[PDB]
């Protein structure tokens, strides 16, 4: 669910981005960006929420009519030219467990460090599970938010795959 305020702010960002795609030139875009902001400021204070909803629906219809058919997309954003370009290089860390001993002997320092991380994960796991059991209602979790660590020497529950995820430029 998106609140009304979230819907308006998403529209404002979308409208500006498509406006920038039309205008291209920076000085021209600055001019029309300020006219568009003025339109949003014109109804900033509209206490009637039935009328503020009607204004929102018409703005979205106006946007769909005016959207650029081929808007600018940041290269690495979904739909961009570089989106997912480096996924083929992302290898999960568990693959290192299958390395041959002669391959591990080339990085004695890296693998000694890695064993400490795996030991840390092993020793934290029981407390992470217990913390989730005790902080979760009887019906079960109602949102996807996870809690922090409440104690000293505890780790935030379910941290391993966030912390150890591949780098964005893994190779």
């Amino acid at each position: 669910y998106l609140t009304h305020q979230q819907k308006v702010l998403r529209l404002y960002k979308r409208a500006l981005r498509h406006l920038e795609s039309w205008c291209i030139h920076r000085d021209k875009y600055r001019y029309f960006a300020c006219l568009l902001r003025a339109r949003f400021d014109e109804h900033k204070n509209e206490k009637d929420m039935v009328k503020a909803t009607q204004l929102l629906r018409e703005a979205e219809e106006e946007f769909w009519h005016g959207q650029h058919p081929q808007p600018y997309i940041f290269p690495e954003s979904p739909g961009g030219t570089s989106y997912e370009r480096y996924e083929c290089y992302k290898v999960p860390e568990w693959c290192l467990d299958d390395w041959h001993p002669s391959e591990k002997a080339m990085y004695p320092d890296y693998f000694a460090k890695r064993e400490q991380w795996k030991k840390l994960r092993r020793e934290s796991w029981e407390r992470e599970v217990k913390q989730l059991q005790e902080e979760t209602p009887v019906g079960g979790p109602r949102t996807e938010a996870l809690p922090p660590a409440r104690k000293q020497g505890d780790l935030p529950p379910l941290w391993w795959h966030i912390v150890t995820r591949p780098r964005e430029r893994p190779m």
């Binding site: 305020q5 979230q6 702010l9 998403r10 404002y12 960002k13 500006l16 981005r17 902001r37 949003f40 400021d41 900033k44 940041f74 290269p75 690495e76 954003s77 780098r167 964005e168 430029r169």
Partner: protein
Amino acid sequence: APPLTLEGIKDRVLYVLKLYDKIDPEKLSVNSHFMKDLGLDSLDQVEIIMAMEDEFGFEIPDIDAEKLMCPQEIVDYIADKKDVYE
């Protein structure tokens, strides 16, 4: 594509905000809440995030962008996406 550093990210984030006419450069620090301290509204914050996307060349999704309320949170968000640790 030279590498980013934590100080470098912070320097450029604060640099952009000091070019925004609605912010007083003499009252701007890394922990200045955009709304509570600098007295900006939520339309201003959308424009601030858009500038950061332009500054660093990548998109911040609206669901994440709405929570970035101070310069330090912007720095941390960028650092996390770019795997910057120093």
